[PDB]
């Protein structure tokens, strides 16, 4: 998941192919309790990177509770393209997971919604919570 948006071109497409194969061979990973958290955190980090005063320095980024880092391109159009592209797999697999086993993923989302750290920043944008609550209602 983390390498799905690498700065090269062939790397991300082969990563997408590998992820598709892994997820269509092991269906139970869809409603796992650890994949969704990382997905939402990565989406939130990308969104925070979207509007960041383009001419600043150090375009690197960090991911909480996971040893990794994220690099972004320079121009704004590339940034919005990559964030828009990443915002589709999350929705598609969320709807697929809710199609099969609703109760377990519903409880997982409810548990994720109550993290204390996200409360203070909740007065900011924090599109991860918005994505979660829109998905659960839609």
């Amino acid at each position: 998941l983390v390498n799905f948006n690498h700065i090269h071109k062939r790397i991300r497409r082969v990563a997408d192919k590998y992820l598709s194969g892994l997820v269509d061979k092991f269906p139970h990973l869809l409603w796992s309790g650890t994949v969704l958290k990382t997905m939402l955190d990565i989406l939130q980090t990308l969104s925070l990177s979207l509007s960041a005063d383009i001419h600043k320095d150090q375009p690197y980024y960090d991911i909480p509770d996971a040893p990794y880092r994220i690099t972004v391109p320079d121009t704004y159009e590339a940034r919005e393209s990559i964030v828009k592209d990443f915002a589709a797999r999350c929705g598609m697999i969320l709807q697929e997971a809710m199609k099969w086993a609703p109760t377990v993923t519903k409880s997982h989302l409810q548990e994720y919604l109550n993290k204390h750290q996200n409360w203070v920043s909740g007065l900011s944008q924090h599109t991860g919570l918005a994505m979660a609550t829109e998905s659960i209602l839609h």
């Binding site: 700065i7 090269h8 375009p59 320079d74």
Partner: protein, 138 residues
């Protein structure tokens, strides 16, 4: 007058191409003005290379660097990002001048330059490429 020479190099001296101006390299330490005055009355570490020329006057360059310093101060006060280098120069006698040369100079005559940049920094997918582009533009 902002730095006092710590030592003098002997064999680094070479004559420049121009009239036979020559080079003088000094191991210098940057201290200040008032403490420099006190130390000179009594008696950060870099190398300074100076060109000594005899036979011509450079008052027009003095006017030029006056204007350059004024423009640089304007831009700094407003808060923009533009680069100019106001190197020093002093006329000490009729036709006798001391010029501060810029170390690590690679003029165009010594060199396509776009091919050189491409070879040095890869394609657009390298951060150094666009960093150099930004510096060149500014």
């Amino acid at each position: 007058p902002e730095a006092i020479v710590l030592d003098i190099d002997y064999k680094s001296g070479t004559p420049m191409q121009s009239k036979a101006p020559y080079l003088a390299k000094f191991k210098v330490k940057r201290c200040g003005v008032s403490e420099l005055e006190k130390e000179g009355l009594r008696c950060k570490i870099s190398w300074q290379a100076a060109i000594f020329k005899v036979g011509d006057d450079c008052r027009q360059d003095m006017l030029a660097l006056q204007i350059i310093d004024l423009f640089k101060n304007i831009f700094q006060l407003v808060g923009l990002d533009l680069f100019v280098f106001p190197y020093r120069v002093v006329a000490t006698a009729p036709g006798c001048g001391v010029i501060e040369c810029i170390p690590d100079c690679t003029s165009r005559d010594q060199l396509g330059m776009y091919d050189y940049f491409t070879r040095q920094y890869g394609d657009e997918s390298t951060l150094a490429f666009q960093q150099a582009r930004y510096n060149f533009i500014r």
